[PDB]
Amino acid sequence: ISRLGPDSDFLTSVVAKASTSIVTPADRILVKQPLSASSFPGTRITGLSSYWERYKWLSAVARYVPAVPNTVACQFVMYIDTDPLDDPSNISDDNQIVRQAVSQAGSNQFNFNTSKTVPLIVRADNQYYYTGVDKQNLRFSLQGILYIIQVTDLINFNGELITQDLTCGSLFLDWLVNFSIPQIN
Amino acid sequence: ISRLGPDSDFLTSVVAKASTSIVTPADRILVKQPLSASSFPGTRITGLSSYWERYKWLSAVARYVPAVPNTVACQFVMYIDTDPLDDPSNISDDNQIVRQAVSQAGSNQFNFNTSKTVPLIVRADNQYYYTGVDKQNLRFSLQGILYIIQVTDLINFNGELITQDLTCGSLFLDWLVNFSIPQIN
Amino acid sequence: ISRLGPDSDFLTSVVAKASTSIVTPADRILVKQPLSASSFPGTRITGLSSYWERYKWLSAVARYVPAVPNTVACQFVMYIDTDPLDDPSNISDDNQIVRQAVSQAGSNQFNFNTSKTVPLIVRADNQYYYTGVDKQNLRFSLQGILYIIQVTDLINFNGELITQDLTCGSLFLDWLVNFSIPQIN
Amino acid sequence: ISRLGPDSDFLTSVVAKASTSIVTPADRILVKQPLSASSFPGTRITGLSSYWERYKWLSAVARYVPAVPNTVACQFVMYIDTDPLDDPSNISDDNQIVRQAVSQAGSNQFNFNTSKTVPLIVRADNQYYYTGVDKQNLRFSLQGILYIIQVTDLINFNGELITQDLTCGSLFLDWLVNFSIPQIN
Amino acid sequence: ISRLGPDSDFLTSVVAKASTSIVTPADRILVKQPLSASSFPGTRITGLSSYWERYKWLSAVARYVPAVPNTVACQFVMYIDTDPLDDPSNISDDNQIVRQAVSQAGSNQFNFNTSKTVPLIVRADNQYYYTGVDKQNLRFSLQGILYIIQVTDLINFNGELITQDLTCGSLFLDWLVNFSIPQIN
Amino acid sequence: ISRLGPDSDFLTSVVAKASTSIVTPADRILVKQPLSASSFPGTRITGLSSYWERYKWLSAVARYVPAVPNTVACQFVMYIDTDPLDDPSNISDDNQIVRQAVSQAGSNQFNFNTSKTVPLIVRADNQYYYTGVDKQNLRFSLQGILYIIQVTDLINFNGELITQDLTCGSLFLDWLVNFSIPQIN
Ligand SMILES: [Ca+2]
Ligand SMILES: [Ca+2]
Ligand SMILES: [Ca+2]
Ligand SMILES: [Ca+2]
Ligand SMILES: [Ca+2]
Ligand SMILES: [Ca+2]
């Protein structure tokens, strides 16, 4: 029972995309990041995660930081599904996807030229999750999955459509974990 | 963490069956009702269950109410298996099926012209269960399954065999739930 | 502010009906009794209700008492809608009607050869209602409407269909009211 | 009496409009959003609202978040009328419309490239409202209606008129409700 | 929540009428004054009432003051109906009209050459009412309606019938209000 | 003695002006707004002010909100003179006008693309002021006058002079008043 954190780690870059690149609701899913302790190869936290059998986030907050000037605009909504077998990749309505998104807890909505954060909501029971690579069922290994859904046109200084996908910011995880039972795995 | 109830909902009708219709022990299983918050389409509780990620019954009591006069008779035993992968559909002995039945906890045994109830026994650990349709494994989604086993001949005012299956009563659920984490699913 | 009761009054007879008489879900509505203080002409309570401007039930419990032997059977569900502009007269599914019924609060379900009761659930706010005949909108005058829905075949001593509608019991109201502001109306 | 929240839901997109599109004061009304628990189809809150007879917002705060860069500008005023039968769609003076707007309580005024919020002011009495679709009178069902009034020219990086309506941001509701009396409706 | 008062305002003149002018019970209704905060154009209170969404009288007392010498006589009864959809304009019996009148609460009866007062009885619930002009239903806007019923012949110094209608006094309102939620309307 | 507020009302639009339009120090006075309770026709507060003889602001804070993007710039100083017979319309030096401005109390200085506020400083004595239109002397009726002085060139994204006056934002009043003695005026 070893409590590590609070500490940070780098997740991914994030790319806003031009209207032309969004043909269906599923195309609005800019990132889909699994949030096991073990799902960020090269990171400190995933490095650690191979040395205990199980983990549980106490706090795991995804932090978006922009890389983009205030002369472009694009609205995201960001959220963490605690059920890794739910999947919005297959909803046929744009509005429905964004609704399902904001209705998660801790969801947050913002213009992509701005830093914002989203907490992982912790379970009511005290469930721990298996470290390491996924085996038969994700519900044993993934405490959550982080999503960014693009809700709005990527727009320019004059309100006109940007013609080309733009890598716009980065995701970082600010984390506090309990790890249980030393293993090497 | 939203505690809903106590409240009621309608499950199914129940049909006692004539000796002729019971050829094997499995034929004695008059109802097999899964008891997830999400397994009664059209009900209030299942309606609700799509708006939180997980659920746990605090109390979930199945209530049988008769629809049959006191000039017919038939003895049921009613019980809720907390393991949704156990399955008595395949026991070859009549006595064995009814034994396995009464030995569950909260089991109850009664003449079908009488109201009776059966509680779901809550887990010793504090396990929550996934709302919504079942995915890979039922043990993640079904907190229990409700059974009525017919133990006795459906008999008439004079002790003679009724010749024809008789829809004899109804099942209702009186429930108290915790729902955790708002989702739309 | 005059608190009258607890006291009783006679509402109506109730008639269970033969399978032949139930052609659509709406046909299952055996009684539809508005529950204003002023909606039972000839009764003591309605007599009183003309002498105050407004009323509010503190307790208003509908009591069914059978008039039928234990050699017939028929299952009712009884409930009081607090919204007098809701109307189930127009649901196309049998199951749906009974579900909507049991899901009301204080609903109760029983075999028609048995006395049972159903309370009116009081509002969370402290709303009073206008006495006397209805004017433009029922929501100003009807604190609730009482329903009996028949859920099951009217059946005989041997489990066979009764061929003819049967007046089976009676409804009584056991009431406690606040009446406000003396008027003659 | 079930207290749900605090939680979020997605209302609508919002479109600022070019001077050319604003010909009369009524044309300044960019959004007119009824705020019953039941008036946002597809949302979590409206999903819930079909399972209780009545509702009352404890807090219902409309949150505008921009989708527009800092090289355009346009001033809104946002407010929630608690009377759903008041209607400014028919005032003949521009100034008068905006005055009537800011004079509501909780009104707020801002440049559309900025996140801002507006609370629903709660009633002095403790009135609950009917869930579900509107029947005869809105005053029984709508606790309020949310408005955005555009007060200023949609202007570009150089102070010149934008020639074309611009979908500029989104509305979200951060809500806390009491729901009373379980119903299915 | 702004408590204004105690303060006064002028309602109307009142005209006693000669036997010849009273042909039916309805003709005895000398005044019929709605008592919303907003129903006295030109007054201070109605002036105010356009700047809050709703109102509720705490005290609203109608004060009759004579304008007539002690050599004429005529008996009034004065009362305030809290139900603005009740209407005595259509009772066929003289006695019945005056009875219905005195039986209101706070009713008062007097000779028209004398100052007298009548309070509005406040509701048992805490209902607020909509300010401004009436929309669909008066029960949302009128907290009450004030009546003067003439019960007796307008008579002269010698007990003989006055031949001609006589404007005999004036009505004033002494009021204390709560106004809720600033609006301009 | 009726304390109204805190509440808001709309004052005016404000127009920054191009270098060409500023020929003398007096031309820098972009707004000159008298702040009696009675000096904003159409507003809620001025509406109210006709129903008491006198008023005194407890707090009266002028709130500027921009309507202009961050690609233009212009520095204002905003202040409220408590002496309505002082008048800077006639100072011959630019620096002197702005000095006299910032030296008022509660004065505030800012770039016009930014929300800022300025309080009215309350008197050391407890002076009340006459409501309604001005009669012989302003010192009996105006508790203060609000000014915006432009201190800097209206400049573009590249530091070059904007050639044309630009309506740049709006003024709102957030107020708390005591009103004394009911009158109709
Ligand atoms: Ca392992
Ligand atoms: Ca799920
Ligand atoms: Ca009445
Ligand atoms: Ca309803
Ligand atoms: Ca109104
Ligand atoms: Ca004056």
Residue numbers in the entry:
A (entry chain A), B (entry chain A), C (entry chain A), D (entry chain A), E (entry chain A), F (entry chain A): 66 to 250
Please, what does the article write about this entry?
A major factor that limits the expansion of shrimp cultures is, however, infectious diseases from viruses, such as P. vannamei nodavirus (PvNV) and M. rosenbergii nodavirus (MrNV), which have inflicted heavy economic losses. The Nodaviridae genome comprises two single-stranded positive-sense RNA that encode the capsid protein for viral capsid assembly, the RNA polymerase for RNA replication, and the B2 protein for host RNA interference suppressor. While the shell domains (S-domains) of PvNV and MrNV contain conserved sequences of 62% identity, the protrusion domains (P-domains) and N-arms show low sequence identities of only 17% and 43%, respectively. In this work, we have determined the cryo-EM structures of T = 3 and T = 1 PvNV-LPs at atomic resolution, the crystal structures of the P-domains of PvNV and MrNV (PvNVPd and MrNVPd), and the crystal structure of the S-domain of PvNV (ΔN-ARM-PvNVSd) in the T = 1 subviral particle (SVP).
To examine whether or not the shrimp nodavirus capsid proteins could assemble into distinct particles in the absence of N-ARM, the crystal structure of the truncated PvNVSd (ΔN-ARM-PvNVSd, residues 38–250) was determined at resolution 3.1 Å and showed a T = 1 SVP architecture. In the final atomic model, the ΔN-ARM-PvNVSd comprising residues 66–250, without the disordered N-terminal region (38–65), organizes into the prevalent jelly-roll β-barrel fold with adjacent eight antiparallel β-strands. The T = 1 ΔN-ARM-PvNVSd SVP contains 120 Ca2+ ions occupying the Ca2+-binding sites at the interface of each subunit, which are conserved with the T = 3 PvNV-LP. In support of the conclusion that N-ARM serves as a molecular switch to control particle sizes, the negative-staining EM image of the ΔN-ARM-PvNV SVP (residues 45–368) was also recorded. The EM image showed that the ΔN-ARM-PvNV indeed form a T = 1 capsid of diameter ~24 nm consistent with T = 1 PvNV-LP. In addition, our two PvNV capsid protein deletion mutants both assemble into T = 1 SVPs, suggesting that a deletion of the N-ARM seems sufficient to produce a T = 1 capsid. Our recombinant PvNV capsid proteins assembled in vitro into three PvNV-LP categories, i.e., T = 3 PvNV-LP, T = 1 PvNV-LP, T = 1 ΔN-ARM-PvNV SVP and T = 1 ΔN-ARM-PvNVSd SVP, with corresponding diameters 350, 240, and 190 Å, respectively.
